[PDB]
Amino acid sequence: HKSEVAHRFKDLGEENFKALVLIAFAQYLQQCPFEDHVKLVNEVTEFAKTCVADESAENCDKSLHTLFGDKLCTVATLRETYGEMADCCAKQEPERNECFLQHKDDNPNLPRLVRPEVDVMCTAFHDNEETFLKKYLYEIARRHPYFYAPELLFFAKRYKAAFTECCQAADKAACLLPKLDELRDEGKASSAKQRLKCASLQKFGERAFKAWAVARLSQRFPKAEFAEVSKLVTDLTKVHTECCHGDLLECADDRADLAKYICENQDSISSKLKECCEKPLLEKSHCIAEVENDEMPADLPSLAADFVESKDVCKNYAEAKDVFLGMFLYEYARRHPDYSVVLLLRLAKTYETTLEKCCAAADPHECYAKVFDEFKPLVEEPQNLIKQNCELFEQLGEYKFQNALLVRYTKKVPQVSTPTLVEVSRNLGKVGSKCCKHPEAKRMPCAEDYLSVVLNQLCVLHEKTPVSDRVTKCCTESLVNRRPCFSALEVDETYVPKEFNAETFTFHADICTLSEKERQIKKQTALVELVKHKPKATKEQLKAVMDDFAAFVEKCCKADDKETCFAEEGKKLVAASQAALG
Ligand SMILES: CCCCC1C(=O)N(c2ccccc2)N(c2ccc(O)cc2)C1=O
Ligand SMILES: CCCCC1C(=O)N(c2ccccc2)N(c2ccc(O)cc2)C1=O
Ligand SMILES: CCCCCCCCCCCCCC(=O)O
């Protein structure tokens, strides 16, 4: 229309508009106090209404980037508090906007946000719902300036719901805590997947991204034509590129356009899009990106038809290599929603290396003829890992299952820090308790999603404090080889045992008064230290000590003079256990 602010305000709503302006300002001006952003928001909202009333009103015709930049350059302590950023105000649009992007701190030095007691939260919530929620929305946004705003708003409403429901509960904590803990992880995962996808698009490039997308979109819309999935991969690639550059306005607009395009060609893409396409502007996109895989066509040919038996394979492949491979991927991915995207990529890479080393052969058709026989082991590796790991997980519980992983990975990389092994193994354990409850056909896609962030977080840490060449080998490896690389690690034999430290295996009754999570991590840490001291120990040998300690802990927390129990019994355990481990 003739007025940008008016337009956005109208088809967004006052509530959503006020929330996004807030998040937008908090992501740039991360150092300003809450009361300061609230003022900006009201001033901007007041302005918007003016434009809604009279489209021709002053400044209402200016662009959003321009207006946003102007108000930004209004902050008087700009230079004093953000130094260099203030010099941005001297530039002219769009150099000004670019300038702001460049000076956005992806991770400032703000104190960790602590979770207050349920009663204080619920009371603060009841006594002033709006400031309570906007204040936190502010704290979150300033700490994650690259987190897509609309996405951040979706989370806020889920938090609003948890309070509404739980603060009315008889037992508030039993209701709230589990919901908050879940919200946090779900949020952290969302954040990580976001940062992960941008980093990938930078290192590996556009080809790999597009490949990843063709596969992913084909599993979802197995009925859409290949030309549609391509049209879509092209636009999706532009969307992410932009959204990754960090410009919110461009990003949002590109996501909107794509969501409308999809909804309009709905019948030509997937049946599962009805619900999503009815929802309001601010959710259409979110819904869609989350949509379930449509049912795949009933009568579908055999891949070997056009890709192994056809006589024009090399002819069609030289014509346009990536198109052909994309086509291969499309046909392969849409017949396998049960495969992880990365697996589909491995098969395509494998099929690619073949056509390259066969279309240059005397008789092509006979050279590549048995290619599908080479997929088998590639497909089975991940399947067997899942079955084998999910079985074990059902035998033991989440907690005990995490201990098994602890022993397993400490042996593979004893050089890694003890608290890093516990963090990683616990998170790994969670992926098992989340994906194993799924029926086989959805397990692999599930593990991939969760495993990708855990492996990324793991690599980041190590990036900072490098400790093993192998981990760096796996971490800097190709995205498609990453997990198989870690799966291929073997017990470290070069490793030299950690010297026995008395303290490290001493325990006081305080563990008794500690919370479930606290006890576990307390035990799990000793478990890692144990394996680092006796790496050549056997599961049996180990299993014995563990269960001994196990009891010793209970048999002392449910005992009279607890401290002596741990002191006297503890002297014994350590003494015997060492004997058992020679
Ligand atoms: C690398 C992480 C990809 C996340 C993602 C996704 O799955 N869809 C997506 C894209 C096409 C079909 C189905 C889902 N879109 C997306 C959704 C809505 C929109 O309007 C713009 C883009 C995405 O950004
Ligand atoms: C008789 C069936 C044995 C199954 C079993 C197993 O594989 N681990 C096990 C034992 C040692 C190393 C790795 C795994 N432990 C176990 C697991 C967690 C725990 O905290 C205590 C013990 C077991 O009890
Ligand atoms: C238009 C569709 C583009 C997709 C091209 C297919 C290429 C698949 C190769 C497998 C990807 C491995 C990633 C990589 O090594 O770059």
Ligand SMILES: CCCCCCCCCCCCCC(=O)O
């Ligand atoms: C070499 C002497 C040190 C032995 C001390 C045993 C400490 C190991 C703790 C094992 C944790 C048990 C976990 C559980 O509760 O199942």
